[PDB]
Design a protein around this ligand. Structure first.
Ligand SMILES: CCCCCCCCCCCCCCCC(=O)O
Length: 133
C-alpha cells in the first residue's frame, strides 16, 4: 500500500504555475489571489485501509478520506463536486477528479524525503513541493 513515509505533516515550500492551474479550473481572481498567497499544511494519516489527506490554511481547509481504488464523492477547495479516485503507481499516490466532463490529476510522490504534488489540467502543469514538518 501507500508508503508509511507519506504519513505525517507536510508544509508547502515551493509552488510553480499554481495561478494558471487555478485558472484552468475556473477559479476567479480574488480566490486565486488568496490561493497564490496560501502556504498550506497537508496532514496524511491512515486508519486501517482508509487514508485521509487534510489540507489546512488560513483561507481554506479541506479533507478527503478514501480507500485505494474506490471512487468517492469529493468537495474540492474551490467547491467543485467531483467523482474522484486515488490509486498507486510505482509508489506515487495518484488522485483523479472528474466533473462536468472535465478531469484533473494530482500525483503526490516522495522525492529525497520531500513530497512533490504534480497538478495537471488541460496541458497546464503545476508543481508544489512540501517539506516534512
Ligand atoms: C488550500 C489550497 C489553496 C487554496 C486555493 C483554492 C482554489 C482551488 C484550489 C484547488 C487545487 C488544490 C490542489 C492542491 C494540491 C496540493 O495538495 O498541493
Amino acid at each position: 500500500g501507500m508508503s508509511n513515509k507519506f504519513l505525517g505533516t507536510w508544509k508547502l515550500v515551493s509552488s510553480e504555475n499554481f495561478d494558471d492551474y487555478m485558472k484552468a479550473l475556473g477559479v476567479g481572481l480574488a480566490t486565486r489571489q488568496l490561493g497564490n498567497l496560501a502556504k498550506p499544511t497537508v496532514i496524511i494519516s491512515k486508519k486501517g485501509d482508509i487514508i485521509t489527506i487534510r489540507t489546512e490554511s488560513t483561507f481554506k481547509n479541506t479533507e478527503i478520506s478514501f480507500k485505494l481504488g474506490q471512487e468517492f464523492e469529493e468537495t474540492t477547495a474551490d467547491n467543485r463536486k467531483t467523482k474522484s479516485i486515488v490509486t498507486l503507481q510505482r509508489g506515487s499516490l495518484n488522485q483523479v477528479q472528474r466533473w462536468d466532463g472535465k478531469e484533473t490529476t494530482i500525483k503526490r510522490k516522495l522525492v529525497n524525503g520531500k513530497m512533490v504534488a504534480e497538478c495537471k489540467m488541460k496541458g497546464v502543469v503545476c508543481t508544489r513541493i512540501y517539506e516534512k514538518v
